[PDB]
């Protein structure tokens, strides 16, 4: 209605679902028949990279993939003019429960991304870009590979793109999975061909990346958002979402809700609105909801919580932080314990190990604690132990995942503690509802 609003808006419009689920959108020409390239042609010829930076810098565009670092500032870490090209690396892997948003974008609207990346590319003066896709999404890798041949055919790639000696080229790079392959330094090993080990970080990829050449890595969503920006202006961007969290975001949900999936909604819409109105209400008694990503602190199912805006900065004010928009709704049909159990059985698999504290500590110890307790072999002592173990991990890690991995269980011991203390002290196995839905 009015501006800088979210929730339900007559003037909200989807764009990243304006044509997703609509087929043949892997035809360039179909894509064409809903803009693009035009916008690049103009931009190259209109405004400097710096100027479109400033545009986004007014847009306030934040990071994605659980990031929220304003991308303007993120360009402020870039050099420009150093005789060395730069690289645009798409963090096109995400994998974590509740997390799946980028997926369909890759599958259904390749030529979009590519335009966004051409735009972005030019912006960070990178004449080649790698899209590093998880190699588990096959369709997406196919559809992308096809698109790059398309664009290359029509001379939208090459070394001249509109006779403009912006030279821009892409390659797709199919993964072999693991969260950590996302890590900004780790990825650089992976790609450059070397098993991940997160590197030194006072060197940022930003100031020197791949073989010295400074790279910028962005999430798909982020990249997609460049096109709307260039199309419709930063004021128009600011017009959507809160001051705090501007634009729309690809919020997602999972768990027992009538329609789970990705809902591209303005930012500052409440949980309540999303969960009931859009997702289609719950189906089953919810214990808690793990809002965003899954690394986010899960917060119990409560009204006052639901009415909080789903945002970067108000889950903040509930002492949490925003993930990838990947909510999980958790029933009390299962035990919360069993959730965190399973969660740390994920993390433990996926340990970098580079976080040593977390190699031996978590992926050795922490996990085993759970296991003992919920067979019904626990004692209060152990939970106390476990509790006390947490700050020893918490501060410090070589990748901030561990510290993120504590946060859910941390929260669950802040709130739901009781449940743990019960089942443990009573040497009681966790219940098992039949999960045939």
């Amino acid at each position: 209605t009015g501006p800088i609003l979210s929730g339900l808006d007559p003037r909200f419009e989807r764009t990243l679902y304006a044509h997703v689920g609509k087929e043949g959108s892997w035809t360039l020409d179909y894509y064409l028949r809903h803009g693009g390239y035009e916008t690049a042609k103009r931009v190259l010829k209109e405004k400097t990279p710096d100027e479109v930076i400033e545009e986004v810098k007014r847009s306030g565009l934040r990071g994605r993939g659980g990031a929220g670092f304003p991308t303007g500032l993120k360009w402020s870490f870039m050099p420009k003019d150093d005789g060395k090209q730069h690289y645009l690396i798409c963090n096109a892997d995400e994998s974590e429960p509740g997390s799946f948003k980028d997926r369909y974008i890759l599958e259904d609207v390749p030529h979009l991304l590519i335009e966004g990346m051409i735009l972005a590319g030019y912006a960070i003066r990178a004449t080649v870009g790698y899209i590093y896709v998880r190699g588990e999404y096959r369709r997406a890798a196919d559809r992308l590979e096809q698109a790059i041949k398309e664009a290359r055919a029509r001379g939208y790639l090459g070394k001249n793109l509109f006779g403009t000696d912006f030279s821009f080229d892409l390659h797709v790079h199919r993964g072999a999975g693991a969260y950590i392959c996302g890590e900004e330094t780790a990825l650089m090993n992976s790609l450059e061909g070397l098993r991940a080990n997160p590197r030194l970080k006072p060197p940022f990829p930003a100031q020197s990346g791949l073989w010295g050449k400074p790279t910028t890595i962005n999430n798909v969503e982020t990249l997609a958002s460049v096109v709307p920006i260039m199309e419709r202006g930063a004021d128009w961007f600011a017009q959507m979402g809160t001051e705090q969290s501007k634009g729309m975001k690809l919020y997602q949900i999972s768990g027992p809700v009538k329609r789970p999936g990705v809902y591209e909604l303005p930012m500052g819409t409440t949980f309540r609105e999303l969960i009931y109105e859009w997702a289609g209400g719950p189906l089953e008694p919810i214990q808690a909801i793990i809002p965003g990503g899954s690394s986010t602190p899960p917060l119990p199912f409560t009204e006052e919580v639901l009415d909080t805006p789903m945002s970067y900065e108000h889950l903040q004010a509930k002492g949490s932080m925003l993930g990838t928009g990947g909510v999980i709704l958790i029933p009390e049909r299962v035990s919360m314990v069993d959730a965190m159990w399973n969660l740390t059985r994920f993390y433990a698999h996926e340990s970098c190990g580079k976080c040593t504290p977390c190699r031996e500590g978590v992926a050795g110890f922490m996990v085993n604690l759970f296991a003992k307790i919920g067979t019904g072999q626990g004692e209060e002592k152990d939970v106390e132990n476990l509790e006390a173990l947490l700050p020893l991990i918490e501060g410090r890690s070589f990748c901030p995942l561990a510290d993120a991995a504590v946060w859910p269980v941390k929260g669950s011991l802040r709130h739901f503690k009781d449940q743990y203390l019960a089942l443990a002290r009573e040497k009681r196995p966790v219940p098992r509802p039949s999960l045939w839905r």
């Binding site: 085993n368 296991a371 003992k372 072999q377």
Partner: protein, 127 residues
């Protein structure tokens, strides 16, 4: 509880098999470890049916293709584990009462173990 005993008895069993296969194929066996709690046992009751905590089958290069370890006496989470080098295959033997010794939940048999072994032996065949 006394689960322990049948497990131990199973651990011997399994070990026996490991030797059998070893001789059978002529493939190299080496005992790896003995119990701490045997070393530092020194008048406190010992009654374990063997002395052997860890043992392995090696290719014939001193490199194992199969490791086989029991949990110690009072070391909680009593299970027996296997793991195939360079495979990321980690097997957790439980005991289940009213059944026998189970691999996840599927009862172990010697043949199961042999199959695991042959695929190991032949596949990984590091030497």
């Amino acid at each position: 509880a006394s689960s322990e005993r049948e497990l131990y008895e199973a651990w011997v069993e399994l070990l026996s098999w490991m030797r059998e296969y070893a001789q059978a194929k002529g493939v190299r066996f080496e005992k790896e470890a003995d119990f701490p709690d045997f070393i530092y046992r020194m008048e406190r009751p010992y009654d374990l049916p063997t002395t052997i905590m860890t043992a392995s089958l090696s290719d014939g290069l001193g490199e194992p293709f199969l490791l086989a370890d029991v949990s110690p006496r009072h070391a909680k989470l009593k299970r027996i584990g296997l793991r195939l080098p360079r495979a990321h295959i980690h097997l957790h033997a439980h005991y289940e009462p009213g059944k026998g010794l189970v691999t996840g939940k599927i009862p172990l048999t010697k043949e199961r173990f042999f199959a695991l072994a042959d695929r190991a032996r032949e596949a990984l065949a590091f030497a």
